[PDB]
Amino acid sequence: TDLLNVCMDAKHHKTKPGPEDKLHDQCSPWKKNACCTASTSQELHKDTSRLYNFNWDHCGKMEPACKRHFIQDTCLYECSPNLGPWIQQVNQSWRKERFLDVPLCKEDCQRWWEDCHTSHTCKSNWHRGWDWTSGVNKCPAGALCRTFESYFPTPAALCEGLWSHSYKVSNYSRGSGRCIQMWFDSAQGNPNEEVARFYAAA
Numbered sequence: 001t002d003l004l005n006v007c008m009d010a011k012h013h014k015t016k017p018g019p020e021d022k023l024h025d026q027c028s029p030w031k032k033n034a035c036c037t038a039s040t041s042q043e044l045h046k047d048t049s050r051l052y053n054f055n056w057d058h059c060g061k062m063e064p065a066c067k068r069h070f071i072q073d074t075c076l077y078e079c080s081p082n083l084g085p086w087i088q089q090v091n092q093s094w095r096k097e098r099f100l101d102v103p104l105c106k107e108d109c110q111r112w113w114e115d116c117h118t119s120h121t122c123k124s125n126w127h128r129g130w131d132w133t134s135g136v137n138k139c140p141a142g143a144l145c146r147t148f149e150s151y152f153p154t155p156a157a158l159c160e161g162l163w164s165h166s167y168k169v170s171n172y173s174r175g176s177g178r179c180i181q182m183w184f185d186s187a188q189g190n191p192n193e194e195v196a197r198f199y200a201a202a
């Protein structure tokens, strides 16, 4: 119960979730109850935003169909008040907590992978090892640009590995209430509230 409606202790996160009428674009589905501020939501839509100086186009321009998923993931990461059950203490410099093994809906993972499989990257883990000497992440020594499929032969590889096991792939479907959706419309509420509620009780 102490795992429901909480914000993890990380760089830009608010202390406690609450309404944010002004959440920008892709993050707007979180507007009734968010862990991110309007400002965070607008900045995260920008290329190489000031949140992390992370450049999605480290291997040329990433296709929009692909980039929207990375934006969506960052919406979830910054805004979701429904990941408490997967929050772990990590004592890193830019976050005391992160989430780990969030049961991501199979199809969200599949779609992410399919939409990105033509785009390019130089690394299978995007958390550690970038060349930051320019102030923005660049491909480090030994890292060649390749298709996403090269670094991520399956959707599970992408969803599980790219952010250091933030997610595990869940064998449940999107409306099931047994897996976290990265994409949702929420007109009838945030579907992930029920998911957190369920796993908290296990």
Ligand SMILES: Nc1nc(=O)c2c(CCc3ccc(C(=O)N[C@@H](CCC(=O)O)C(=O)O)cc3)c[nH]c2[nH]1
Residues within 6 Å of the ligand: 052, 054, 073, 074, 077, 092, 093, 126, 127, 128, 129, 130, 131, 132, 163, 166
């Ligand atoms: N699910 C999810 N998880 C995320 O983390 C995330 C992010 C943040 C990504 C990010 C990547 C690299 C570094 C960075 O600067 N890395 C350094 C080392 C960092 C350190 O000191 O620990 C590097 O080695 O390149 C810092 C932050 C955006 N969307 C996300 N979605």
Ligand SMILES: *[C@@H]1O[C@H](CO)[C@@H](O)[C@H](O)[C@H]1NC(C)=O
Residues within 6 Å of the ligand: 171
């Ligand atoms: C995943 O779900 C499908 C049905 O949707 C099922 O056939 C399969 O057995 C499941 N996988 C596992 C390992 O349970």
Ligand SMILES: [Cl-]
Residues within 6 Å of the ligand: none
């Ligand atoms: Cl489409």
Ligand SMILES: [K+]
Residues within 6 Å of the ligand: 079, 080, 081, 082, 190, 192, 193
């Ligand atoms: K959520």
